[PDB]
Ligand binder design. Structure first.
Ligand code: NI
Length: 253
């Protein structure tokens, strides 16, 4: 049950404070508040200090569980999509929220993609003026990590493509089918993860809480995201065709 507060320092750098809710005093110049394994104390803390609640039924608005983006006059909420090990992956969701120009992330597990997000924010030369600048950089880091995963699948697909097409350096036909099937699932999960981030960034673009600097950056990430979706689709066709060729060999032989 941990609470990390990221502040903009006097020297215009970011510093991470391991914050103790029950005793310590709140810092100045907060950029981003990270809640890991929150208990009712941490949930009570952000509500009492930043007016941040998450009921699924309220009087003022119809809350739709069939969306992953919600915005009222003061806050934006995003249930953001991540992939974590279950190689077999599974969906992990992190709640993002904005209040008083501060980014909030609420997470229930620690996973490697979020550690990479932490390291990049702490080491970026970018000057973050508020929490909206943070989420801007996070979307960029998240699309890169999805790209690295498509690249890894690409390496594995080329090895399989060579092995099956030229019938050279093959192993167990069943084992090759297991791998192809595993890569197909990874490809499908990353593409869907990329679709989720497209919908969120596009909804952020419409907010008037987001200044022109962030909208320009989200647009650049969106173009690259689209490139990765194209790459993922070409890649899945290759995997499906390797599976078809491999099944053809089993049956013919
Ligand atoms: Ni700005």
């Amino acid at each position: 049950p941990m609470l990390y507060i990221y502040i903009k320092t006097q020297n215009a750098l970011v510093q991470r404070i391991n914050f103790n809710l029950d005793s310590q005093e709140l810092p100045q110049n907060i950029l981003w508040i990270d809640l890991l394994h929150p208990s009712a104390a941490e949930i009570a803390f952000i509500s009492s200090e930043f007016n941040l609640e998450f009921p699924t039924k309220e009087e003022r608005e119809e809350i739709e569980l069939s969306a992953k983006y919600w915005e009222d006059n003061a806050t934006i909420t995003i249930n953001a999509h991540f992939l974590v090990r279950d190689i077999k992956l599974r969906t992990e969701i992190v709640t993002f929220a904005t209040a008083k120009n501060i980014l909030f992330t609420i997470r229930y597990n620690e996973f490697s993609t979020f550690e990479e997000i932490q390291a990049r924010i702490l080491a970026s030369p970018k000057n973050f003026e508020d929490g909206f600048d943070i989420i801007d950089k996070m979307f960029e880091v998240r699309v890169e990590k999805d790209a690295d995963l498509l690249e890894w699948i690409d390496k594995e697909a080329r090895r399989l493509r060579t092995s099956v097409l030229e019938k050279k350096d093959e192993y167990s036909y069943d084992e090759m089918l297991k791998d192809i099937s595993s890569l197909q699932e990874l490809n499908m999960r990353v593409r869907d993860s990329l679709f989720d981030k497209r919908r969120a960034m596009t909804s952020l673009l419409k907010s008037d809480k987001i200044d022109k600097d962030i909208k320009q950056n989200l647009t650049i990430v969106l173009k690259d995201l689209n490139s990765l979706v194209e790459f993922s689709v070409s890649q899945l066709n290759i995997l499906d065709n390797i599976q078809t060729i491999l099944a053809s060999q089993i049956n013919i032989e």
